[PDB]
Structures are given as C-alpha cells and as structure tokens.
Nucleic acid binder design. Structure first.
Ligand SMILES: Nc1ncnc2c1ncn2[C@@H]1O[C@H](COP(=O)(O)CP(=O)(O)OP(=O)(O)O)[C@@H](O)[C@H]1O
Ligand SMILES: [Mg+2]
Length: 443
RNA sequence: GGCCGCGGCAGGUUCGAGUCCUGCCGCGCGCCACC
C-alpha cells in the first residue's frame, strides 16, 4: 500500500489483456482491408491509434477525409455511404455531426466523415481537429501509454470521465494532454491539487498561467478550450480526489463504485428523519439522443428549482433520472407546507394617490402601517411544493426545454412518499440527500 | 438541442417595473455536446 505498489495493482485494471488487443488488431486489419478496396482517403485516430484505450473499452475510430469544397450535405451523404459499406452491422444516431456507429468482427467502430484541412484554424466541421490531434500526439505520447490509462481509469472509476453532457467531465484527449504536460499520472495528481477555477494550462507553450476560467489550451488551436465542458463542480470533485489520494493512497480509487438496493422502508425513515418534502416530476422520455436530453433535464430541473425558491418553499437540492421509458425530476424542500396568508408591500403614507389605489382593492383582511409604509395581507394560491409544481409544470411547460416541455405538456404527474421509492430513482435520491453507505465497489 | 451575449418589442405580477415571471423577432459561419 505504498504510492507505487498501488499504481502497480491498478495497472492490472486499466491495461487491456492480450486477448482483447488481438481482437482489436484483427478488426483493424479487416477494417483497412475494406477501406482500401473503396479507394477512400482515411486515417486511424483516437485512443486506439495511440494505444491508450482502457481495458474493456475497445473502440476503433476511423476518419474519412473529404475535400474542403464539399457541402455539409455532401459530406454527410458520402460519409454515411462509405460507413455502411465497411461495417458489418451499423447504426446511425447522432446529434449534429453525422457519423456511423457499428461493428466489425465484433469490435466497436466509428466511421466519422470530416474535411481534409491544411492547418486547422477555422475548422468547417466540429471534428476537423481530431486528425491534427493524432498527428500532434503520436510522437509525444510514446512510452506514456499506461500513464494515460491510469488517469482515464482513475476518472472513469469516479464517474467524471467523458466530456459528454451526461458527464461534463474529462475528455479522453484532455487526459492525454495532461500526461504530456506533467509526464506521469502521479505528476498530474500532485499538481492538480493546487489547480483553481482560474487555472490555464497551455500545453503548446509548456506554461501554466492564470485566466478568466479553467482553460486547457489546445495545441492544435489556441482558441479552443479542451476542457470547455468540464463543469466547475466536476473540476472540484477531481481536485478533491487528488488531495485525498496523495494523503492516503488506495486501490479503491480505481474500483468502480455501484449503487446498492436500498429498502423502501429505510428510505422512508431517512426522509421522515429529515422532515423534508421529497417529490418527483414523472413524464414520458422524449425519443432523442442523450446529448439533447440531458441539457434539457438540467434546464427543466433548474426552472422548477428556481420557482420553488421564489415561492419560499426553501429547496435543498435538485436531481433527475432517465430510465428507458420515463424521465424523473426530483426535488427536496425544507417547507412541506406554508401558510396561505403573506404580506404584500404597499406605498408610503405620503403620496395618497397611490395609497388610495392600494387600499381600494377588496381584501379579506384589513391592511396596516409599518415603519412608514402600508402593507396588506393576501392569500397564496397553493400551500405545498407539490401543489406549486403541479401549477408551474402545467402552465409553464414550454420553458422547460423544447422536447422535455412538450412531453411534460402531453402528460406528467407528481410522485411523492412511498410511491416514489418504488420508482427507479433510489440511487439518485441517496446521492441527493447525502445518504451514507448506499454504494459499494465489491466484485 | 443546451449555453453566453448585444439589442429589442409586447404580455403577465404590482400602488409602482429598464429591475421579478413569460412569449416572439433580429444579429454574433458566437460557445459546447454527439468523434
Ligand atoms: N470533446 C472532445 N474534445 C476534444 N477532442 C475530442 C472530443 N471528442 C472527441 N475528440 C477527438 O476525437 C478523438 C477520439 O474521440 P473518442 O473516440 O470519442 C474518445 P478517445 O480519444 O478514443 O478515448 P477513449 O476511447 O478512451 O474514450 C480524440 O482523440 C479527440 O482528438
Ligand atoms: Mg475510441
């Protein structure tokens, strides 16, 4: 359990076994075979072309390079055409930039179209940097392949690996750049401890400077932030892990933790013990790609959260879950119930024109003077968070994100109490409430 | 699809809204995710 003895045992988890590598090379051999027959200009990129892919996470990426003059429509129609021709079984589901996800001799293959650029300054597609990424990295990353795998494994084990909106973490390319800049996994951990939200890491200049935000400058484009989608919270979650790790190294930092089945009874006691209002918004999952869904669940969850605050229900945290058929928006509030009366502010006693208008309004109770101005008692239209959210989600469905809001329009329901705990949201609830010992890394 | 802006224009809430909530339109090949 010394710092180096643990990195040894951890390499056994992040390094692909030779049986998997062989499967990769065989699929690569057949992939090159089919591509050459089509006479298309291509290149192998990604974690496979640099031998930095994690054990069990084998995926081959193949870029097809087309002329610059090609329309975005022409890039798509030709890219997919080649893709489908090369893959055994394929599947086309993307958010913006078209590509073909499929299989070849049993390995994951992605056939991505892009523009054959010279100098990637003002890229035309979103992925035009990826070939230049590989050209820059192949010569510098050599020998350090396992140092990347330790970092990728360290992050993946703590659920902050991936730049996708489902994660808002560290892209696989960002990890490689960090190894080139620090030299080893251990040197990234040591230094990361003293990162701040202002940290700038310009790899191309071998410099660390201060800035407006966290910013890892892309060697290929000095305007591009490689860590653009890394949330501030996930940045923090990473820094915290590094301080903990150096303070007390362990193999558990590389073991993937998984949720535990919590009894609906134990959960009922925890919420009762807290005396909070725990409820969820349930609706049909819109049939869209994850990268459109999660930004919208974030928005919807926030709009309702903000609503609960200004309505004085004092919300603690928000959360959401996406099962296969349904989406859930969870909320916890300190106020299970509020009074119906509240005090609305009136005008100062001086200017009677406004006061006369104010006191003319028919109210159930008599208004009063306080510290020099008039006040009135008025009634709330709802007295619980559940009743409030029912109203907001009903009327303001449209502001909760395009697809989520339209799905909430057609149907939603507020689930509370024991009926909630029987829903696929236990894991999310335990995280939200800070429930202890609802996780394990047992194999 | 989400996000950040420069503008706006109306509508709602209110004694009172450039200031809180909402809708619509313009313009930055604006940024990010899908590799
Ligand atoms: N969000 C992002 N930011 C910067 N570059 C990205 C990126 N997503 C993809 N890329 C580029 O596309 C290449 C491969 O992308 P992916 O296959 O999706 C992850 P990877 O690099 O293969 O690591 P991984 O297989 O361990 O997940 C990367 O080398 C990178 O150059
Ligand atoms: Mg890959």
């Amino acid at each position: 359990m010394k710092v180096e003895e643990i990195l040894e045992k951890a390499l056994e988890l992040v390094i692909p076994d030779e049986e998997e590598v062989r499967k990769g090379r065989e699929a690569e051999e057949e992939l090159r075979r089919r591509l050459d027959e089509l006479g298309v200009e291509y290149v192998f990129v990604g974690s496979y072309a640099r031998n930095t892919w994690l054990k069990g996470s084998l995926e081959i990426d193949v870029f097809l390079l087309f002329p610059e003059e090609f329309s975005k429509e022409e890039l798509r129609e030709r890219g997919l055409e080649i893709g489908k021709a090369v893959l055994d079984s394929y599947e086309i589901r993307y958010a913006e930039h078209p590509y073909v996800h499929g299989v070849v001799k049993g390995v994951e293959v992605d056939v991505v179209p892009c523009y054959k650029l010279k100098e990637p300054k003002n890229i035309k597609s979103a992925v035009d940097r990826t070939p230049f990424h590989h050209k820059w990295l192949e010569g510098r990353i050599k020998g350090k392949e396992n140092e990347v795998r330790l970092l990728k494994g360290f992050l993946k084990a703590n659920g902050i690996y991936g730049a996708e909106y489902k994660v808002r973490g560290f892209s696989g390319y960002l990890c490689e750049l960090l190894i080139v800049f620090y030299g080893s996994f251990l040197e990234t951990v040591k230094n990361a401890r003293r990162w701040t939200r202002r940290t700038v890491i310009d790899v191309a200049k071998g410099e660390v400077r201060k800035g407006e935000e966290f910013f890892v400058v892309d060697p290929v484009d000095e305007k591009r932030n490689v860590a653009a989608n890394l949330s501030l919270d996930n940045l923090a979650r990473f820094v915290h892990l590094c301080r903990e790790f150096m303070e007390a190294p362990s193999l558990g930092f590389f073991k993937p933790k998984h949720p535990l089945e919590i009894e609906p009874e134990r959960l009922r006691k925890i919420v009762e013990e807290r005396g909070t209002a725990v409820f969820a918004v349930k609706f049909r999952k819109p049939d869209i790609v994850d990268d459109n869904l999660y930004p919208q669940l974030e928005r919807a969850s926030r709009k309702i959260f903000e609503f609960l605050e200004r309505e004085n229900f004092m919300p603690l945290r928000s959360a959401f879950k996406a099962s296969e058929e349904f989406c859930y928006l969870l909320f916890e509030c300190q106020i299970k119930e509020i009074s119906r009366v509240f005090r609305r502010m009136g005008p100062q006693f001086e200017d009677e024109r406004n006061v006369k208008k104010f006191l003319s309004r028919n109210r159930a109770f008599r208004p009063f003077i306080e510290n020099g101005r008039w006040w009135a008692f008025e009634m709330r239209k709802f007295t619980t968070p559940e009743e409030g959210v029912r109203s907001y989600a009903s009327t303001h469905w449209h502001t909760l994100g395009k697809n989520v809001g339209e799905s909430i329009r057609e149907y939603f329901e507020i689930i509370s109490g024991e009926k909630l705990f029987k829903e696929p949201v236990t894991a999310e609830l335990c995280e939200m409430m800070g429930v202890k010992d609802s996780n394990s890394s047992s194999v």
